[model samples]
Target: MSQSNRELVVDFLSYKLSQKGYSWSQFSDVEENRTEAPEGTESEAVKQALREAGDEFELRYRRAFSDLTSQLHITPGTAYQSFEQVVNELFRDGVNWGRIVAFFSFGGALCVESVDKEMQVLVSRIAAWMATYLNDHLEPWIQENGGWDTFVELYG
Candidate 1:
């Protein structure tokens, strides 16, 4: 429904890209009784679970992310083109919840690396690209799997 997770994509990107003036707010801890995950989702658990999934994905695949970064060719001149190619390879096998989480993790890494190289402008642009791809490519599967509510239970 009109790219429902766009704000989550931004918050997730910004959550990863924060402190460098990219994050919209502090990293949320549900324990802190604050909801930084944004709205539009069916429930708070969905957004928190999504963010947690991103964290877990990155933590679990640190080495793969490093290797992927090495291969990304992330210059300001070719970031989008490279992202498209790399994503094709990343998801060529198929889509699953694990891979969906990996996609967000991958996007976060790109944004952080871009900022590291002084390309803050690309951070949000890349976030938009991520959300677009997630909507068109991944959200259908998410819906098929009972949406983010199911994610909260599966990955919560």
Candidate 2:
């Protein structure tokens, strides 16, 4: 039987997270830190776009999180100290945002390639997770670098 998209995304995220010596434990804290869209920013379309993107992102995040725990046999607890080390190393080499995003897109593509074609949808879901990851952890740096527009232009 073919794996569902949720399972595929969970496995893909688990694989990538583990590769960096991190886990969903490091990724899930965004829920508490999540902020709303700026009160009166731009056109409705842009606002709607951001809202819809975030909505889809949240949907997949929940599904992936649930599937990751129940289906993937992930261990309990959230520990980010291990991830802090990995992140610190990246900064030591100067900002490498392109490399960072490429790691997710390329690595996720590779992960999905090994699965059924339908499971390929997880690639974007992984990208969404990356977006949230950036939003949650690197908002200040992201703004300093060129903000979300630049990120979308280059990565989208």
Candidate 3:
């Protein structure tokens, strides 16, 4: 089920927030459930490595969260459009490692701010949005480059 991917991302964001001394209601109830992939087409090792790679990018731009999200607008209602707009702005110059990291960092920053406002519910939808972006958008580029395996090695 896609719950695996969504929950994996949710768990990662939870860890990201935890490191900052914050907590989400769902986070407190988290569990290890990414053991299965959505389509059963990928190994747990691949997904796990990809998540860790995302972790690297998230950390690389941790400090930019404030400045990045500060300039954007994101309330629960407008998150979908706002995310699309902000992502468009970030990728206006096309995708690369820096912008890719910005994508992850931006997503993480949104989660941080949403949780800060006690908009914990938004975090889940944001996780879905993030996974959609990764699956449909970035996955193509990553696949062309070398798939998740080389990604874990190059950035592993």
Candidate 4:
């Protein structure tokens, strides 16, 4: 099942990614799946987020695939998968929902770069919104739970 969001989904992923410390990962195929693992639980989280984000991103944005993937490193045989995963999945949410709304924008930023240079600024703005929104809205609720792992099991 999916969760509800006050704003777009991508914002949540960005906030989560920053909270965790991983920037973002973008990859295309399994062949591109990078061998890199998280330096520890921390790093691993960001990478996992990247992996999950990339998978999720592809489902939404297809036309922007090649250029975005090329510039953002969404190709095969590489590390990282998508920005959404890098953010959402990477973080140790006191309680992780199956997915968040902002993940799309987080991953979409890579593609936005392909649209125009102006997108860089816009993307940054979007990412910033994600950070603040997460702190303001999700953090309080998140801090009191058993973490996203339990969330995953309950839902999975």
Candidate 5:
């Protein structure tokens, strides 16, 4: 017998989310704090890369969050505002920016809160894409950041 369309989509999304969560947990850990390596120390080129990565992740996260929030009868602006709060609370003291990489990684899965029959699978995928895109493209540069390898190991 064949599985339902929703089941297939949900399964794919689940797989994607698992990958995302694992990836985020990578950056969440550092060998000696989040800023102890090359990118951690901040060169001009590294800062630029981090900035661009942050922009890309924010764009995708905002769009996905907006869509999901609406489905759940929440306002776009309010939801985003709340997201900022959560991010702040999660990494209080200052923004790691690398968390941008991690957030891009798993924040999408965090957005997936479905009650009853309302779910945004595509939006969830978009969120997952934000993380996956960063992980694949920025592998070399990211390694320059301190404890990135530590992150990868601890997460995976």
Candidate 6:
């Protein structure tokens, strides 16, 4: 049976958090005293407005990543190579950060399921590379999308 998107993201997040020595409960907690909203937006208003939008982002992207394997016709072998090519092309084209997040999420899922050590390494590296790209090139976009607080508020 296929795993649900929530299940897949939780699996990925568990592995990620474990490596960082964190847990989900801590990961999900809202800040006690966040700073005022930027510029014109009110604190409560920003929070309230972002709440629904963030949920939709989390839901759609989670499902997109979870369904990536089936969508791409990738299986347990040379398919990972093709995925690599696709990812590289995406970088060249300056793909959106949210989709890049989905790519890494999907790669993480692939790494979890693969028994081949080489495949595991490649997919893991690809995910890591994508993350590096996000940090260097896409951070401003992330900040614009409401930053880490918003992500945890929605995704966690």
TM-score of 2: 0.33
For residues 2-21, could you state the per-residue lDDT of candidate 5 as single tens digits? Answer: 11212222233333344334
Model 3 stretches astray by more than 4 angstroms: 1-8, 22-73
Task: Write the residue-wise lDDT of candidate 1 on 9-109 in tens digits.
Answer: 76677666662355533332212233453555455456578788887777666655443344455778877876676667777888778877878877877
Model 5 misplaced stretches (Cα beyond 4 Å): 1-74, 94-106, 114-147
Q: List the residue pairs that clash in candidate 5.
A: none
Model 5 has a clash total of 0
lDDT by residue (103-128, candidate 2, tens digit) is 23333433233222333333344435
Report lDDT (Cα) of residue 72, candidate 5: 38
By TM-score, rank the candidates, best first: 1, 3, 6, 4, 2, 5
Candidate 6 TM-score over all chains jointly: 0.41
Model 1, C-alpha of 130: deviation from truth (Å): 0.3
The lDDT of model 2 is 0.38
State each model's CA lDDT, in order. 0.67, 0.38, 0.61, 0.39, 0.38, 0.44
For every model in order, what is the number of clashing pairs?
0, 0, 0, 27, 0, 0
Clashing pairs in 3: none
Candidate number with greatest TM-score = 1
What tens-digit string does per-residue lDDT give for candidate 6 at 1-156? 111222223334334433335333333221222133345433333333333443354457556653333344444555556556666676566655455455545454444333123243444444444444455555465567765445445543
Off by over 4 Å in 1: 1-3, 19-43, 63-72
Candidates by lDDT, descending order: 1, 3, 6, 4, 2, 5
Report the poorest 10 consecutive residues by lDDT, candidate 1.
25-34
TM-score of each: 0.77, 0.33, 0.67, 0.38, 0.32, 0.41
RMSD of each: 5.7, 13.7, 5.1, 12.8, 15.8, 11.4
